[PDB]
Amino acid sequence: EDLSNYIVSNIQDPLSRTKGVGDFQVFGSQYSMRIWLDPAKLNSYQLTPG
Amino acid sequence: QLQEGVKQKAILAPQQGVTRDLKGQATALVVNAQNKVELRVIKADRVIGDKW
Numbered sequence: 015e016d017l018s019n020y021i022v023s024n025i026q027d028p029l030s031r032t033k034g035v036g037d038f039q040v041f042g043s044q045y046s047m048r049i050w051l052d053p054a055k056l057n058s059y060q061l062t063p064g
Numbered sequence: 065q066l067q068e069g070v071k072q073k074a075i076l077a078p079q080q081g082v083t084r085d086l087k088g089q090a091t092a093l094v095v096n097a098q099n100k101v102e103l104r105v106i107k108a109d110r111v112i113g114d115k116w
Contacts, residue, residue, distance in 0.1 A: 016087055019086065019087075
């Protein structure tokens with residue numbers, strides 16, 4: 015996923031500049047700020063994930 | 065502003081010397097004994113003045 019972020023970030027924009035490349039399909043996708051909730055520490059402060 | 069603790073051997077790196085990688089981990093470059101530059105991923109947590 016780190017390498018797929020590197021592809022989607024900055025070898026995807028110069029690759030479609032070239033004469034002849036139509037649509038394309040990168041493997042994987044870019045990043046996401048992925049948040050890992052802890053259920054015991056959600057219990058500890060009286061919080062639902064909603 | 066409470067103060068607790070004191071470090072004996074604390075390594076204070078400047079803010080222009082440590083940056084952020086695209087993954088988010090704080091990185092800072094190091095030159096070696098054979099005079100080449102090299103990258104090691106560090107754990108920068110607090111700021112003191114203008115120094116990580």
